[model samples]
Target: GDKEECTVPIGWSEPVKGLCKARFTRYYCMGNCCKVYEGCYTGGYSRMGECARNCPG
Candidate 1:
């Protein structure tokens, strides 16, 4: 978990890997996107593809 700084960056940001979709929660990371969630009590992790593809604006 990196500091996303944007407690208000709008919907989901398309900046880089654009918020690593893991677990039942969503997040943005500059590095270790997978490792960020790996430390938590985890399950249901996968690259479900582009955020916009799943959620268009």
Candidate 2:
């Protein structure tokens, strides 16, 4: 898993107060082992599409 830092706009500020410190996991895909993981934040928002589109295997 790798650290992915993200931020969102909830209030008006140049330096954002809210931050989403999440992780992205890279795994092997086979059969029914496929799984999708999305990031979440304190602002009730999420960052999707982090999963690899094409498997490197």
Candidate 3:
């Protein structure tokens, strides 16, 4: 079976010393998880939907 690809929204942030802290609000997929890192593949099922935000320090 051909694996399906879907887009899932994810939040990313990085803290810097004295510099401006950057936060990214974008979409990522389990492909980067499974195909790249061989991590857990959840089939792109976002239980929180696409409009969720994760604030990082």
Candidate 4:
């Protein structure tokens, strides 16, 4: 949660240990950015695009 200056609300979320939604889960960060990356979303407090790309197998 390195989220400085930015704050998040109780939005919906999902897990990553799956067959993926993007067929490799990825999204247009619901926060305030428009970059592309992939990572695990556990806290379900996902992403201001917080954690950068770190795909699993």
What does candidate 2's lDDT look like per residue over 1-57, in tens digits? 989633323453232333346454323222222232232323221222222244321
Q: lDDT of candidate 4?
A: 0.39
Q: 1-57 in candidate 4: lDDT tens per residue?
A: 685553233583433344435554444343443233356543332433443333110
| Per-structure clash totals for the candidates | 0, 0, 0, 0
In order of TM-score, best first, we have 4, 1, 2, 3
The per-model lDDT (C-alpha) reads 0.34, 0.31, 0.29, 0.39
Q: List RMSD in Å for every model shown.
A: 11.7, 13.0, 14.3, 11.2
C-alpha positional error of residue 5 in candidate 1 after TM-score superposition, expressed in Å: 15
Better of 3 and 4 by lDDT: 4
Clashing pairs in 2: none
Give the clashing pairs for model 1.
Answer: none
Cα error, residue 41 of model 2, in Å, equals 27
**What clash pairs does model 3 have?**
none
How accurate locally is residue 16 in candidate 2, as Cα lDDT from 0 to 100? 30
- Give lDDT tens digits, candidate 1, residues 1-57: 896532224454342333355445432232223222332333334343432233322
Q: What are the models' TM-scores?
A: 0.17, 0.15, 0.14, 0.21
- lDDT tens digits by residue: candidate 3, 8-48: 23663222323224342222233233112121233433333
Candidate 2 total steric clashes: 0
